């Protein structure tokens, strides 16, 4: 789960909605029976899949928690000097506007 969580990025930029219902043939109007599509919809609503993580990760791109310091040029060399001052036994102040 961890590797899938970190290394899944890309998204299918171009999609067509309501192509999923039409692919399986289950929709409001089709040649399939009326109750059969409902029973299939409930069976799919029940049975669970382990791949839901890859599914939800590949659908929407996740900012996660990690882009806070990676989108700021000042935060790139900040935590580094905070580690350097940490290992040297020093205290620091931060003044902002």
């Amino acid at each position: 789960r961890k590797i899938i969580d970190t290394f899944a990025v890309l998204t299918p930029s171009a999609v067509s909605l309501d192509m999923r219902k039409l692919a399986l043939g289950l929709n409001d109007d089709s040649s399939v029976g009326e109750n059969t599509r409902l029973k299939v919809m409930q069976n799919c609503f029940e049975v669970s899949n382990p791949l839901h993580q890859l599914q939800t990760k590949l659908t929407i791109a996740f900012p996660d928690k990690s882009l806070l310091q990676y989108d700021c040029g000042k935060l790139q060399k900040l935590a580094i000097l905070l580690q350097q001052l940490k290992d040297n036994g020093h205290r620091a102040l931060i003044f902002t506007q």
Partner: protein, 434 residues
């Protein structure tokens, strides 16, 4: 620090506003006529008027064909799509060569759109089923600046049930595509348990409903794949639908024409703008005649973007043909629609300048004498070999602690590494097939 493989010292064609090519610009020495005729092609692509035009450049090895074909891609800019391709890639086991050749033409024409998406976010207050058919669900999402309730589709309800959301957990719901994401449990419930594995996130700031517009660009073929095959979705029926036919299939001309029509209806609203691109094929001599003869008909089409070919050969037989002999391994009927750009080999001084600039971009110091030796090398063996020996000489200089290359180091590099001409000489006289 900076990785350099046979490139990155070329920042473009380096042409002035009048079209005249300088002797030295952007990592380019000599080859003035080819850079000029190439810049003319650049302006032709920027004009967008021409379509289905093909220009091939024929020259000896090391003459800089490919290196010049990267400069036009650098000159067009990142906004213009460029599709590097090798003639050996057109052979595919899953789909026929013809479909793989036609596909790249659709991949070479980019189309940028603009669309607005609606976003809902907030902490969940109430969740109730309205329950044959899967009933809808009323969601109580609580924004920080307000409170709003919204009814949801049964499918997005299924995705919600699969995400194990609960009352008081911050979630994220996309309107158009129906995507569902959970950020985490609300920060106010952090004190409910002393030890729990679930992280706590603050309440999303702002209104529940938010909007914005995106300039996002999508290649035309990427838009065609969407209409051709289903794509990932959080529902199970989506995963089964995409898992029913994972193998790629050939697209009929009808679907392509319809997608083109809806593209036109998109450009009528002023939402999108269609721009062409450049298809580049390396080693065109490796193509079968079946791909050439299809290139005869495919270039006559109006939607076919400008394509550029590269081949280094003399008079040779076309692959797949028995008695047919034609220049550059291309059939004579296809060569008619093609325009040729000739390349010339460099002289000694131009080789010396090449090794100089490549040494400067590689960030390495070379003394004048060892530089002259590298030039003589470049004349007596090959241009690629002189550029190849540069790094080992610097490594030996690192072992000797010297900060500059010396004649002794490049001579030692000549002793340790051999070129093709020496190795063939060892091949002619040997015991058992060295």
């Amino acid at each position: 620090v900076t990785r350099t493989a046979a490139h990155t010292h070329i920042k473009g064609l380096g042409l002035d506003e009048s079209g005249v090519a300088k002797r030295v610009e952007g990592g380019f020495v000599g080859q003035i006529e080819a850079r000029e005729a190439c810049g003319v092609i650049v302006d032709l692509i920027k004009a967008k008027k021409m379509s289905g035009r093909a220009i091939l450049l024929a020259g000896g090895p090391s003459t800089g064909k490919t290196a010049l074909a990267l400069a036009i891609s650098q000159e067009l800019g990142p906004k213009v799509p460029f599709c590097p391709l090798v003639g050996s890639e057109l052979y595919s086991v899953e789909v026929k060569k013809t479909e793989t050749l036609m596909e790249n033409f659709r991949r070479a024409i980019g189309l940028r759109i603009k669309e607005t998406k609606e976003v809902y976010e907030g902490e969940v207050t109430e969740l109730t089923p309205e329950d044959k058919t899967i009933s809808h669900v009323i969601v109580g999402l609580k924004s920080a600046k307000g409170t709003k309730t919204l009814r949801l589709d049964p499918t997005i309800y299924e995705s919600i049930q699969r995400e194990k959301v609960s009352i008081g957990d911050v979630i994220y719901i996309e309107a158009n595509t129906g995507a569902v994401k959970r950020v985490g449990r609300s920060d106010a419930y952090a004190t409910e348990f002393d030890l729990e594995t679930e992280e706590y996130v603050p309440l999303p700031k702002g209104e529940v409903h938010k909007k914005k517009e995106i300039v996002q660009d999508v290649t035309l073929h990427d838009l065609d794949v969407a209409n051709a095959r289903p794509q990932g979705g959080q529902d199970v029926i989506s995963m089964m639908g995409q898992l029913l036919k994972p193998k790629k299939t050939e697209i009929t001309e009808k679907l392509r024409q319809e997608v083109n029509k809806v593209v036109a209806k998109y450009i009528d609203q002023g939402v999108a703008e269609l721009i062409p691109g450049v298809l580049f094929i390396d080693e065109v001599n490796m193509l079968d005649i079946e791909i050439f003869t299809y290139l005869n008909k495919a270039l006559e089409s109006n939607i076919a973007p400008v394509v550029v070919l590269a081949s280094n050969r003399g008079m040779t037989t076309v692959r797949g043909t028995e008695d047919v002999i034609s220049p550059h391994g291309v059939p004579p009927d296809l060569i008619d629609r093609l325009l040729i750009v000739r390349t010339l080999p460099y002289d000694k001084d131009e080789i010396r300048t090449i090794i100089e600039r490549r040494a400067t971009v590689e960030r390495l110091q070379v003394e004048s004498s060892a530089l002259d030796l590298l030039a003589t090398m470049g004349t007596e063996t090959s241009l690629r070999y002189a550029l190849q020996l540069l790094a080992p000489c610097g490594i030996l200089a690192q072992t000797s602690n010297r900060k500059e290359i010396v004649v002794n180091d490049v001579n030692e590099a000549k002793l340790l590494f051999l070129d093709a001409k020496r190795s063939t000489k060892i091949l002619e006289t040997s015991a058992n097939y060295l």
